[PDB]
Amino acid sequence: YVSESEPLVRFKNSVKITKGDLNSWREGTDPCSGKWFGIYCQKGLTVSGIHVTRLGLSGTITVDDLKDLPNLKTIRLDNNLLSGPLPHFFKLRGLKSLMLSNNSFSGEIRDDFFKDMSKLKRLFLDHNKFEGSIPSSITQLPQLEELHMQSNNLTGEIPPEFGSMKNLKVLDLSTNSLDGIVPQSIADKKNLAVNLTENEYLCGPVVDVGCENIEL
Amino acid sequence: YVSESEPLVRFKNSVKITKGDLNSWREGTDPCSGKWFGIYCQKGLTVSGIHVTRLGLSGTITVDDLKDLPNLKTIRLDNNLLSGPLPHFFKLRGLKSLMLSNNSFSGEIRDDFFKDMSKLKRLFLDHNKFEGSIPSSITQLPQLEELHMQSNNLTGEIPPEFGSMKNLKVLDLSTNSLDGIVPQSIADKKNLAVNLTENEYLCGPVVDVGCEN
Amino acid sequence: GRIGYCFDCARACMRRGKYIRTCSFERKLCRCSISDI
């Protein structure tokens, strides 16, 4: 819809693009025409997804304008230069897919970050610089099907509550410094593709590592 | 999960167990191990239910620890000595079944109590000391299948919204003190078993007040 | 040193019929695989 051009133009003007432009985002035109870079629309009627990748987006992201798009379900900002703590995507309670792969977001994600995002199906946080523990609210996402957090700086144990996530089919936590013992609930989960490799001090079933310290 | 033992032990310590014990509820252990008495779990992994009956549970129960159990769906505390007002179970917005039969809960239940309990399907409040009118929020429970409030001290008129209820199959209001007028909108039904027995003052025609003490 | 420590760790795992999986000299940690060579 033409009305959806107004929040999108504000979003465009809130981000710093260092490799490219969003000149196609022209106020007063319909973002669903086919002429707008990186816009997906439901049935060609209403904005449902924003895919702004490889534009060297720099600084942070705010969601106060994106929240004015009633039917927005997907955000993909992969392969940019964004930094700082995770932006407040939890204000977009209807979001179904969040992809932030290959940026420089940092910090420990607040444990309750994901509490309001009940519709989230896909969460890609890989290849960033997140630190600290996996936020416990991620395991409370009723609809989550895929979690990718590989290539970060995470530490601490893997929450066993991943094993109770009914819809979870892909779990990539590799290349971090997670530790402790792999939860049996994850090892036993049927129809799960899980990758826990390159977590040096993690032991147990899925990583094929005996926990016992051999003192030689 | 081991993380669920903490609120359960807190709940265990918050009530007085007069006639039995919950020795199986051990801190630092998983309540889904198969060893915790009175615990249901979903797929042997996470706590989904508590059923602690005939242990002489005395005093008041608070919901501040049960809220920390993310996947709790069913609570059964039947045949105990619990007392005071109906605890604030509306904080557990995901609860599917609430069973409190044969206790000493008292007072009038707040009318809007059940507004937030949308997922609720089974509600057993029978054999207590509840007073006042039937809370009308019960009639707007979307998924409510069975309602058991018999053997209380309720008063007032039966709300007509009970007959426009989505999935209600049982409504037992027997042995109370209800009055007013029987709704025709509950006699019309679709497989609604209704037990209104032993509620004498409900007759539709308000005639001469015989049998008056 | 670290290289000699992890050599001895690899030998210990071999004697148990396992692969070496984890070796930290500073933490004196040696772990082998659960699977067999």
Numbering used by the authors:
A (entry chain B): 27 to 242
B (entry chain A): 27 to 239
C (entry chain C): 14 to 50
What do the study authors state?
Orthologs of LURE1 in Torenia concolor (TcCRP1)15 and A. thaliana (AtLURE1)9 were recently shown as key attractant molecules, indicating a significant role played by these secreted proteins in pollen tube guidance. By contrast, our data showed that the LRR-RK PRK6 expressed at the tip of pollen tube is an essential receptor of the same attractant peptide and important for targeting of pollen tube to ovule in the pistil. In the current study, we present biochemical, structural and functional evidence showing that AtPRK6 functioned as a receptor of AtLURE1, strongly supporting previous genetic data. Sharply contrasting with other LRR-RKs, AtPRK6 recognizes AtLURE1.2 through the C-terminal loop of its LRR domain rather than the LRR portion.
In order to probe the recognition mechanism of AtLURE1 peptides by AtPRK6 at atomic level, we solved the crystal structures of the AtLURE1.2-AtPRK6LRR complex crystallized in two different forms by molecular replacement. The AtLURE1.2-AtPRK6LRR protein complexes in the two crystal forms display a nearly identical structure. Two AtPRK6LRR molecules exist in one asymmetric unit of the crystal with higher resolution. Interestingly, one of the molecules is in an AtLURE1.2-free state. The C-terminal loop of the apo-AtPRK6LRR including Cys237 and Cys229, is disordered. In contrast, these two cysteine residues in AtLURE1.2 bound AtPRK6LRR form a disulfide bond that is involved in interaction with AtLURE1.2. These structural observations suggest that the disulfide bond-stabilized C-terminal loop is likely important for AtPRK6 LRR interaction with AtLURE1.2 in vitro. The C-terminal loop of AtPRK6LRR is mainly responsible for its interaction with AtLURE1.2. Arg83 of AtLURE1.2 is located at the center of the AtLURE1.2-AtPRK6LRR interface by being sandwiched between the C-terminal loop and C-terminal extension of the last LRR of AtPRK6LRR, forming hydrogen bonds with the carboxyl oxygen atoms of Tyr227 and Cys237 of AtPRK6LRR. Additionally, this arginine residue tightly stacks against the disulfide bond formed between Cys229 and Cys237 of AtPRK6LRR.
